[PDB]
Short mmCIF file of C-alpha atoms (C1' of nucleotides) and ligand atoms in Angstrom, two decimals:
data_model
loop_
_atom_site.label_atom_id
_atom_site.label_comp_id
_atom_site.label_asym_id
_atom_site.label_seq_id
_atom_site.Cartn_x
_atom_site.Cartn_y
_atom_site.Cartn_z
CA UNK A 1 63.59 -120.04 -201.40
CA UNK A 2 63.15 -122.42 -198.36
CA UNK A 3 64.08 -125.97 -198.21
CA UNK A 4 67.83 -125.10 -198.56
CA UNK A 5 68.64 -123.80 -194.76
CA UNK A 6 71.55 -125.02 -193.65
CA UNK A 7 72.98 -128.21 -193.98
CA UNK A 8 74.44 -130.34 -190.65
CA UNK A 9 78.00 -130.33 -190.24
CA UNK A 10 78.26 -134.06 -188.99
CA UNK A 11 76.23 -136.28 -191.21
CA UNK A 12 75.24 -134.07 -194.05
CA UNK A 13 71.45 -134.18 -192.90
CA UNK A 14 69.59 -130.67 -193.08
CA UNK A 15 69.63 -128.22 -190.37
CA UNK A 16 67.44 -125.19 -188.70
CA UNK A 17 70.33 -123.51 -187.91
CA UNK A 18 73.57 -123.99 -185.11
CA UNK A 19 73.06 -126.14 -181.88
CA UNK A 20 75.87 -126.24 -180.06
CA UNK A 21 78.16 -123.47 -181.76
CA UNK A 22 77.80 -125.36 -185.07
CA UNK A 23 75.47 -126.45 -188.05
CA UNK A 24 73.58 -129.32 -187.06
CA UNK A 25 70.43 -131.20 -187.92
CA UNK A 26 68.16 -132.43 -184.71
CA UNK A 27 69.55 -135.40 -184.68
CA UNK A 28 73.09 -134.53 -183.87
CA UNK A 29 71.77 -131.68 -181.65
CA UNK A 30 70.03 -134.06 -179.58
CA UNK A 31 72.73 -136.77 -179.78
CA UNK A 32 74.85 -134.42 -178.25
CA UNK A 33 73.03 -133.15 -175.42
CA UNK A 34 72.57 -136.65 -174.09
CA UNK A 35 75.75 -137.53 -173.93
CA UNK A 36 77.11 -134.69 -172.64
CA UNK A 37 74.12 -134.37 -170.01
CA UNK A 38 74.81 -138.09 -169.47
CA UNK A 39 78.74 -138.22 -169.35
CA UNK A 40 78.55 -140.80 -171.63
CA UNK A 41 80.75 -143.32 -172.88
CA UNK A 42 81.56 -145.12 -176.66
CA UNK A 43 83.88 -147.16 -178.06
CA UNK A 44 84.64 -147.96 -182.07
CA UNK A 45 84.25 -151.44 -183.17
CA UNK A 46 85.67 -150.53 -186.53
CA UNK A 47 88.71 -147.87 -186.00
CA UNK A 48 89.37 -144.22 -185.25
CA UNK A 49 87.24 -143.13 -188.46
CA UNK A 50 83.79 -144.51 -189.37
CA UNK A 51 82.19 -142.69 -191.92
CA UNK A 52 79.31 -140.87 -190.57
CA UNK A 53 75.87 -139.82 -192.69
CA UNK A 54 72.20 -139.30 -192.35
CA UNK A 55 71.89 -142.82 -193.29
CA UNK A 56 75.09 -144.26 -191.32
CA UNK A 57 74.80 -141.90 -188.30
CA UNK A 58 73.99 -144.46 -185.12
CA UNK A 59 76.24 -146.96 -186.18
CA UNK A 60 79.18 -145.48 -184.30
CA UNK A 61 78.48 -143.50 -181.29
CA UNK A 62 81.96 -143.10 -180.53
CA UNK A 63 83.15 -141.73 -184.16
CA UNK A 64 79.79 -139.86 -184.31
CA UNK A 65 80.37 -137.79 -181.21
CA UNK A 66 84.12 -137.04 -181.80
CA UNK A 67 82.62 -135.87 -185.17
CA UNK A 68 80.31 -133.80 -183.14
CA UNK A 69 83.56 -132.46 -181.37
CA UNK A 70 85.99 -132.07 -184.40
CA UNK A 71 83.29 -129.89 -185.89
CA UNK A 72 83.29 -127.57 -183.05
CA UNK A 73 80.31 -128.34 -181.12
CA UNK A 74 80.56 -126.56 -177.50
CA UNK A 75 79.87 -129.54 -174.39
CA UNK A 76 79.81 -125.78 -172.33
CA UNK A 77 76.89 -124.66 -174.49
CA UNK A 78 74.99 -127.32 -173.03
CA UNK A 79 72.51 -126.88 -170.06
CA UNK A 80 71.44 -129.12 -167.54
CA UNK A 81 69.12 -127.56 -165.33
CA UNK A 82 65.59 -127.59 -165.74
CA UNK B 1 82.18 -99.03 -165.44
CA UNK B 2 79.15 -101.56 -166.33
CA UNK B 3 77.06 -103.14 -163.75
CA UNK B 4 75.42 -105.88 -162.36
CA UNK B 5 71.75 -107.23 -162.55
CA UNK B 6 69.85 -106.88 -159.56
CA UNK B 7 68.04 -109.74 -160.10
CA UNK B 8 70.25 -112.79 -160.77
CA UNK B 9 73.83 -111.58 -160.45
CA UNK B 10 74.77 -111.36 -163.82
CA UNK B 11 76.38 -109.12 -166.10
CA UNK B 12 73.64 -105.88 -167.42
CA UNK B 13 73.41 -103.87 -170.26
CA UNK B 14 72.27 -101.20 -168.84
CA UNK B 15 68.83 -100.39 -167.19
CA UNK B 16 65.17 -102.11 -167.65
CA UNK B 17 62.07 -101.58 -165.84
CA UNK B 18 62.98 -99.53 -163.16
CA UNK B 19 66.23 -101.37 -162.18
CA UNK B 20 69.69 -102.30 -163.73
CA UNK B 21 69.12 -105.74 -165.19
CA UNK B 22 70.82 -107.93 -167.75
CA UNK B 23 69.11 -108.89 -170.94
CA UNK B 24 67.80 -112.16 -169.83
CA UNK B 25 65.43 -111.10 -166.62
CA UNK B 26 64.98 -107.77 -168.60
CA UNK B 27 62.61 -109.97 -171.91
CA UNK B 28 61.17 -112.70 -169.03
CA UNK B 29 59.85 -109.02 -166.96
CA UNK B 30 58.20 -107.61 -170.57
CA UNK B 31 56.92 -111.31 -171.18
CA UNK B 32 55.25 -112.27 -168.11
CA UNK B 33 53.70 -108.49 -167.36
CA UNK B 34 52.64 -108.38 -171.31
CA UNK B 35 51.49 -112.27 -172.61
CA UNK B 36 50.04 -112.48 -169.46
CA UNK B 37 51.60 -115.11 -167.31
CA UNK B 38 51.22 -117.10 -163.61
CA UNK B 39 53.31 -119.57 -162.86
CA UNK B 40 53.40 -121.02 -159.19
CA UNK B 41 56.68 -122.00 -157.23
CA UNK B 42 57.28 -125.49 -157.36
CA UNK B 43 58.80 -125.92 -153.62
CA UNK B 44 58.35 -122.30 -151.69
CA UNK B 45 59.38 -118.69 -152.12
CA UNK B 46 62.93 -119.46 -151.83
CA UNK B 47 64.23 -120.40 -154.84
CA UNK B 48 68.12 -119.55 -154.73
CA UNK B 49 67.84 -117.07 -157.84
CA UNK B 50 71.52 -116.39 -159.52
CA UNK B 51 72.59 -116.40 -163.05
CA UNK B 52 72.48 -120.56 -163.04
CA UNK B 53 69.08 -121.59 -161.49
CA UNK B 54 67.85 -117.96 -163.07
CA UNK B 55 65.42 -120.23 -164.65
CA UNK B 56 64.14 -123.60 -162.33
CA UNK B 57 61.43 -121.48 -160.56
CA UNK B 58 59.65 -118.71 -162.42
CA UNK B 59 57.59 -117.75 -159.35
CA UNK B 60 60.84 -116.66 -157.84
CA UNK B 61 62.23 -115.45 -161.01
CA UNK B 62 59.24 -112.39 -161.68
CA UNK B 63 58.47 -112.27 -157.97
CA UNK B 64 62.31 -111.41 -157.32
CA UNK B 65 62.07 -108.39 -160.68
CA UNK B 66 59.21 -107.06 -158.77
CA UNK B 67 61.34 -106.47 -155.02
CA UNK B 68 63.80 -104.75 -157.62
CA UNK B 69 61.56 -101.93 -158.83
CA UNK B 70 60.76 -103.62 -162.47
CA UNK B 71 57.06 -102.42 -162.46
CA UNK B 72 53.79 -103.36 -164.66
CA UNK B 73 53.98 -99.49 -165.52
CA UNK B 74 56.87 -100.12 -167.29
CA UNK B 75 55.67 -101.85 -170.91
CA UNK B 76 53.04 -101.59 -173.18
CA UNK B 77 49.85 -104.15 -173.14
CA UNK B 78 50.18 -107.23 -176.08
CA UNK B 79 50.23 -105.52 -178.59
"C1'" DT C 1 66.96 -97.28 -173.44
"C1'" DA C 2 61.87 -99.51 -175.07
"C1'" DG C 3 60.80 -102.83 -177.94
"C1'" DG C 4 60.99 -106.25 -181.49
"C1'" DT C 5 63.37 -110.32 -183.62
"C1'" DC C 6 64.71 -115.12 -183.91
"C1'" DA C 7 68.72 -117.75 -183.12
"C1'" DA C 8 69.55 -121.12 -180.13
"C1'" DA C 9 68.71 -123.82 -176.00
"C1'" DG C 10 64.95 -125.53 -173.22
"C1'" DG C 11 61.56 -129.37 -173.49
"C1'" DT C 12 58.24 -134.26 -174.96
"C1'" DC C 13 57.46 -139.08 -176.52
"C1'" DA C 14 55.78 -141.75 -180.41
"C1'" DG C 15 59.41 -144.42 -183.30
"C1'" DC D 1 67.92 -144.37 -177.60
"C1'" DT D 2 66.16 -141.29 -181.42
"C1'" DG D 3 64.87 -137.25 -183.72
"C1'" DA D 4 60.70 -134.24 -185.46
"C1'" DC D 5 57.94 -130.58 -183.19
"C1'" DC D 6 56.98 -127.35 -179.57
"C1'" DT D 7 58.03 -123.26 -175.85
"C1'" DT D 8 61.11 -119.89 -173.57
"C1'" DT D 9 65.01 -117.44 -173.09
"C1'" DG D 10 68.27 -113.76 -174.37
"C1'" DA D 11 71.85 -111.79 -177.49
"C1'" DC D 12 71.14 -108.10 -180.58
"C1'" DC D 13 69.37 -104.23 -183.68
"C1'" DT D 14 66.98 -100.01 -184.35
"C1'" DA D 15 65.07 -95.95 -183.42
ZN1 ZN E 101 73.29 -134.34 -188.17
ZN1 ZN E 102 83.60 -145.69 -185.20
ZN1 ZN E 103 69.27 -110.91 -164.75
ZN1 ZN E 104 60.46 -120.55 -156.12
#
DNA sequence: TAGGTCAAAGGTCAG
DNA sequence: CTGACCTTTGACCTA
């Protein structure tokens, strides 16, 4: 076995293992941490709910990162220090 | 009653290389004593080292295991 | 405990 | 920004 892992909880893309206290793929592990390190800010041009994918991820920065929070992803489990 | 780590504040689980330490200060001791390392402070031996900035200066970090007790006596060679 | 393991959290920089 | 690779740190297990 190998190329099944796990699978990211945000856009279905594959994943090493949990990034911030949930499945995700490097993408939405770095996505994350530079909003969060960044205090940034999105808004949806479409609605609440966009549907997000590997393919369809960085449409939506706003319904991609509430995504990233209604999975469970911890902001606290973030670091900014170097 | 558990204890504290006498290195960066935090919380221990149990005792390391001579001292009471917490997990974290405990495998960065083995580390730099074993896969050799030598890292230089990047301001000055001062380096405010707590459970937070445990790991902006490394200098500080192993220089502050080694005013503990945590000794080079303490692990075995890369092995 | 020592003493490993290996998740997870750090980083860089061509795309 | 982004995300594929790359290093260090520590929560954990066992003996
Ligand atoms: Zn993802
Ligand atoms: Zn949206
Ligand atoms: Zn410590
Ligand atoms: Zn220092």
């Amino acid at each position: 076995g190998s190329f099944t892992k796990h699978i990211c909880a945000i856009c279905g893309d594959r994943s090493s293992g949990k990034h911030y206290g949930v499945y995700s793929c490097e993408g939405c592990k770095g996505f994350f941490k530079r909003t969060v390190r960044k205090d940034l800010t999105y808004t949806c041009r479409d609605n609440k709910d966009c549907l997000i994918d590997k393919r369809q991820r960085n449409r939506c920065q706003y319904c991609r990162y509430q995504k990233c929070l209604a999975m469970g992803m911890k902001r606290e489990a973030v670091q900014e220090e170097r």
